[PDB]
Amino acid sequence: GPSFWLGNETLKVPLALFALNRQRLCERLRKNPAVQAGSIVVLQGGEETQRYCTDTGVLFRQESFFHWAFGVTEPGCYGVIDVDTGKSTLFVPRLPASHATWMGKIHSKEHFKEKYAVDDVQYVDEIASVLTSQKPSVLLTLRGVNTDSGSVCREASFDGISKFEVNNTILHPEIVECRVFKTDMELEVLRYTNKISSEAHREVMKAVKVGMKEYELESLFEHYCYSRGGMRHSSYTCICGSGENSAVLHYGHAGAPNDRTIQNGDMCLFDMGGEYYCFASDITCSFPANGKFTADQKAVYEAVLRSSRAVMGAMKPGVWWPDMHRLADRIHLEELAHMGILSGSVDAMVQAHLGAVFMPHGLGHFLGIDVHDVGGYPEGVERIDEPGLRSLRTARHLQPGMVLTVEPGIYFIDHLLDEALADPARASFFNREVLQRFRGFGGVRIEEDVVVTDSGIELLTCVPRTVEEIEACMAGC
Amino acid sequence: GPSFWLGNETLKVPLALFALNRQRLCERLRKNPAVQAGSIVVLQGGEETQRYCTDTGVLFRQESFFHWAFGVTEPGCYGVIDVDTGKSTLFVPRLPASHATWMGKIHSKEHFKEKYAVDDVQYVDEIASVLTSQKPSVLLTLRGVNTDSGSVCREASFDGISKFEVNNTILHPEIVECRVFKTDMELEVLRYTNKISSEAHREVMKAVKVGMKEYELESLFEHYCYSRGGMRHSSYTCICGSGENSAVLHYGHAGAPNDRTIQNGDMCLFDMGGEYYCFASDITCSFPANGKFTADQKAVYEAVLRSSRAVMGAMKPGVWWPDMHRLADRIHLEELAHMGILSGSVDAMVQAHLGAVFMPHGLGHFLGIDVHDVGGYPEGVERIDEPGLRSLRTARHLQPGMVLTVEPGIYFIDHLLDEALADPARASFFNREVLQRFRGFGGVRIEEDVVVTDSGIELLTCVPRTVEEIEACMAGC
Ligand code: NA
Ligand code: NA
Ligand code: NA
Ligand code: NA
Ligand code: NA
């Protein structure tokens, strides 16, 4: 059948991918004992937006659940799925015949039907009529709480919906759960987003020169991803932290917009990932600006390399994700002790949650259509109220088909260091004369994207990682 | 004093630019007989947003009126200006000390005071208490209708505002009028945005090759603008129309995403403009994909060049903008007749509104902090209900300090030509034996940004324009 493509060397994504998603959603819904026969899933697509009160258009990116189900790139659509039959209907805007002037061809409904391989296409203004005709028992709409933002999903509405029975509680947990497990077709797209983003990271490492602004590398990264990968969007705002900014976890946003001059001796921590057809990638590379690790930089870096590889090697079905977080903590503490920053029993350090002083964020998260993907905390899976672990975006056990980032890091963050040094249960583990050398060091994060397999993981990311590989890459070898 | 700068060769913009805007707004309001003594202007800044229900952040860009008055890059602020004294107070978010875990150093109020050169800085949650202590007579808030989008400006609101007298009618027309007339400091920024965008257009003409995707040039343009000009945003989504797509006026949006392969013999129409520190640029260059104009391409192109230069030569204070639109129409019609596409009396063609068949859009618009800048249709200025002229974004008379685009074009749009050919009042002008050669030609638009001076215009844009210049640029001169 048909495929989404941006030509050149970009990936052809079969529209069958979305058909399979629709089938899987229906299969799950049919197993749910609360679901009535004759139910119809109703999703509302994103709409075109403008900046504030202006007419300045914002580039449209589809809403993630709607994209998962339909793969539709146009704004202003709806999509419905008969649960019992699996039959899909796309609803497209009826554009005035007088509109070929400003926006482009006025495509027929037949064009959209063949483009998206759905069962039927109707106009948005006909939705109440078309639904009334099907005599559904209930409309299943999307409403629930995203566990990363705390936002409530936008439930579909249309002129005439009040005439229907509507259930807005059943669908969200089921569609979330389907999104958690990537199909083989979805994995092909994620391999591709990781391929292009990995190439772009390598180009950035080759291009970095002392004296550049951080944003020069952001620009280069996005230019590679778009011109060579067809990635018009990134998956999140690029983090190009250099020097002390590598310790700033929330960096690159408008209040800290990648505007520091990279200096000789600085570490760089670049967390960037292109998006292709609404599928994410998320990769972080850390390396010395000047292309040569100092002894202290090599020590910190190789500690995170060790925890990265230990977590990847331990991951397999049945592994509890918080145990991976604690595994990384333990390794970091051992290496920070080997380095002389810490002294004493690593067992006692773990008991005092010292790892969270150095890695306050979660070890990694699900990834898919959203970079922080849905389904980390379904009902019955509890957040753990401890330093570090409270920041984890899932406390689930791993299963085949889950896609995770693995992103341990070690940072020297003054607020956290100083808090630990004030606490008698934690202060004694520090050698202050050694820690002093590391104030302003910045931080190192190594982030890989992986898929859980039947026996372990498959790594999607392909960037230089050892000190040797990084130095050779940056030397222009 | 302090300036905004992104380093390297980027423009240093003094924060005194915004202080001057605030002073101008107060001087205007002091002269307004309806403004009460002790009035305070209250503006609310833009807030940080995420994609839909996800935690994926959208890169924050300040709201335009708020930017014009304060130049503040951070989300979540408010700003007030005492009218009688001109005293400015910025209100900033209160971040808890623990956010230093994720954000590095949390900036003090003093930091923001020095950064923005305002008189005072307070936390947002203290706004009601601070205003109460000032004992203002009335708060002047922003509400009015944007004449391009039809949207209503977001009026400031905070907890406790109901305890004050609020006027939401006076401010909008006044602050809009200040924005219409650019200061010397603003013109320096618009000259810079034109310089960078001009260079980037030149790089695109040098790089275009038959066989590329349109979006490869969008990517290159945006990369030049960000890496070399510090332009993180474009002023609007890039329009990169090749071949038939050059006749689609706002091509490049999500539904038509610059995804055509450029062919030998195609015309390209590239409408792209970087934004620096929320100041716009808007430039359109038209040129043959293969670097060599055919006779037909040269004739259409030079017709638009003729109207471009006639309008620029005619613009001066006191000129009614709709007269410039009609001037361009007349020239296009003369030239289309001189190339054999039309025959008969140009006077009769103008009476028949034939110009609007070839140029269905307005001649040009105000430009400033928004690409389609505010103030085109203040109370008393009426829209003209005629083809072409109906699309004008202003019917004002020109005055010194206004900034306008001058963007005549000629396009071969099938549904417009077909309408004309089906209308006995218009059909007779066409020579179908010559017209047939231009079906699928696309279109040409030449867009310059200019400032109205005391006696004429200043051209901001600096790209090759003659056939000879364009061929030389594409040949790498
Ligand atoms: Na990341
Ligand atoms: Na991540
Ligand atoms: Na393993
Ligand atoms: Na334009
Ligand atoms: Na324009």
UniProtKB/Swiss-Prot annotation, chains A, B:
Cofactor remark from the record: Binds 2 manganese ions per subunit.
A biological-process GO annotation: negative regulation of programmed cell death
Disease cited in the entry: Prolidase deficiency: A multisystem disorder associated with massive iminodipeptiduria and lack of or reduced prolidase activity in erythrocytes, leukocytes, or cultured fibroblasts. Clinical features include skin ulcers, developmental delay, recurrent infections, and a characteristic facies.
Amino acids binding Mn(2+) 2: D282, H365, E407, E447
Keywords associated with the record: Acetylation, Collagen degradation, Dipeptidase, Disease variant, Hydrolase, Manganese, Metal-binding, Metalloprotease, Phosphoprotein, Protease
Functional summary from the UniProt entry: Dipeptidase that catalyzes the hydrolysis of dipeptides with a prolyl (Xaa-Pro) or hydroxyprolyl residue in the C-terminal position. The preferred dipeptide substrate is Gly-Pro, but other Xaa-Pro dipeptides, such as Ala-Pro, Met-Pro, Phe-Pro, Val-Pro and Leu-Pro, can be cleaved. Plays an important role in collagen metabolism because the high level of iminoacids in collagen.
Binding locations of a dipeptide: H250, D282, H372, R393
Name the record gives this protein: Xaa-Pro dipeptidase
Annotated positions binding Mn(2+) 1: D271, D282, E447
Catalytic reaction equation(s): Xaa-L-Pro dipeptide + H2O = an L-alpha-amino acid + L-proline
EC id: 3.4.13.9
Quaternary structure annotation from Swiss-Prot or TrEMBL: Homodimer.
GO cellular component: extracellular exosome
GO molecular function, one term: proline dipeptidase activity
Modified residues (Phosphoserine): S162
Gene that encodes the chain: PEPD
PANTHER family: PEPTIDASE D, PTHR48480
